[PDB]
Design a protein around this ligand. Sequence first.
Ligand SMILES: *CC(=O)[C@H](CCCNC(=N)N)NC(=O)[C@H](Cc1ccccc1)NC(=O)[C@H](N)Cc1ccccc1
Ligand SMILES: [Ca+2]
Ligand SMILES: [Ca+2]
Ligand SMILES: [Ca+2]
Ligand SMILES: [Ca+2]
Ligand SMILES: [Ca+2]
Ligand SMILES: [Ca+2]
Ligand SMILES: [Zn+2]
Ligand SMILES: [Zn+2]
Length: 432
Amino acid sequence: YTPVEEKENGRMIVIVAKKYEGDIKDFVDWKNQRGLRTEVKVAEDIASPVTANAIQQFVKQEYEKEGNDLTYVLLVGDHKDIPAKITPGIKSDQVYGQIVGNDHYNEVFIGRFSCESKEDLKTQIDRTIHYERNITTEDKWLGQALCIASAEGGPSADNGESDIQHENVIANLLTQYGYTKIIKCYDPGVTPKNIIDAFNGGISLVNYTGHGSETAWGTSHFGTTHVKQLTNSNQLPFIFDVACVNGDFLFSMPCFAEALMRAQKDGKPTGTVAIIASTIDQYWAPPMRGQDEMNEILCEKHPNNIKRTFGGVTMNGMFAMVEKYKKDGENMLDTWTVFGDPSLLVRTLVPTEMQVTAPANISASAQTFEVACDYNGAIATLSDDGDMVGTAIVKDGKAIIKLNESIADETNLTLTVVGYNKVTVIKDVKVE
Ligand SMILES: *CC(=O)[C@H](CCCNC(=N)N)NC(=O)[C@H](Cc1ccccc1)NC(=O)[C@H](N)Cc1ccccc1
Ligand SMILES: [Ca+2]
Ligand SMILES: [Ca+2]
Ligand SMILES: [Ca+2]
Ligand SMILES: [Ca+2]
Ligand SMILES: [Ca+2]
Ligand SMILES: [Ca+2]
Ligand SMILES: [Zn+2]
Ligand SMILES: [Zn+2]
């Protein structure tokens, strides 16, 4: 299949319901600070009442603009705030990113921060910023994974694997890549305690393959009522969830996925940093292929298809499903919904540090700024209070940042450098 790229110069639009307009600033500032051009659009400004047709039209319109650099779209609100596209048998956010080619292969990654209160939003913003900005060499819970499998399935499943055999292949792939601990919770016998203990012990990735209801997992019986028992404060995994309706966010109560994204303990984020879960019932075999490819891409098994964002990893993993299962695969892709930031830079192992050498000062008339970094591929960005002044990728040991405006009016600039499985570096640059 042809992958959908995380365009180096891509941008993001956060479509936020009016009642949350004044609460998203810190998120928008951080994204611009690390080099992802991000703009905000108030949903009611697109149309009031807000409808699925208007959102769809707005995204298409923005995508068509000269360059087609639109790459991510984050929806901020629950279904009542920003609706999902609803057609017979389909509830979907993913469809908003299907713009070209009369097909179901997205052009744009879509994600959602489902919130019904200000704190639901604040906790999703904070956990995301902490994950990309504040993870250090001491966050030892990274590189540890949890595989969960029902005792069902067989020869007629994807690649003829029962859910257990399917998860074992995934566990081997993760181990080969470098994960240091794989926890296996396979039926029969899994209880809520087993899941609660795993999360509380520290894990950065969860793969689930089995049955599910709107509010719980069939294997373990762990559900929304058990979320309050989690104490994995800012030690959050992301999840590839194969199950029926765990992601039905139009349910009368918070669904499984929403509960995990909104969980908090004494003001700190618990639960998950991101999860992809279905709004409808899932077929047995198709999602298995998608889940496998997501893990293959995460473990960099395809050198010319590297994806660093949660949206990029999951969407490209689903392309393989569509390719092999066709129509059935397309229905699964449309409804397998991303909860969390689609631009999220995933972490797989305990990070290492980067050696960054940059001038302590910059001329008020400078057009460029050179930074030395011992990690090629890092993204170096200069910003001013959430305003991105220039960004560049490290190549051959250095990044040559071209300023997009005059800094003659500034006294200080913030240099931010991020890198895959690296500790984020933030330095000040005095303007002389
Ligand atoms: C509801 C679930 O949680 C279950 C999730 C399966 C995930 N894949 C793996 N664990 N490997 N889904 C089902 O059990 C599925 C639900 C469904 C019902 C009606 C239409 C479409 C999906 N049911 C089945 O797979 C059964 N084999 C019945 C069936 C449905 C569709 C075609 C053929 C058989
Ligand atoms: Ca397309
Ligand atoms: Ca509260
Ligand atoms: Ca498999
Ligand atoms: Ca049960
Ligand atoms: Ca909801
Ligand atoms: Ca593959
Ligand atoms: Zn923090
Ligand atoms: Zn079954």
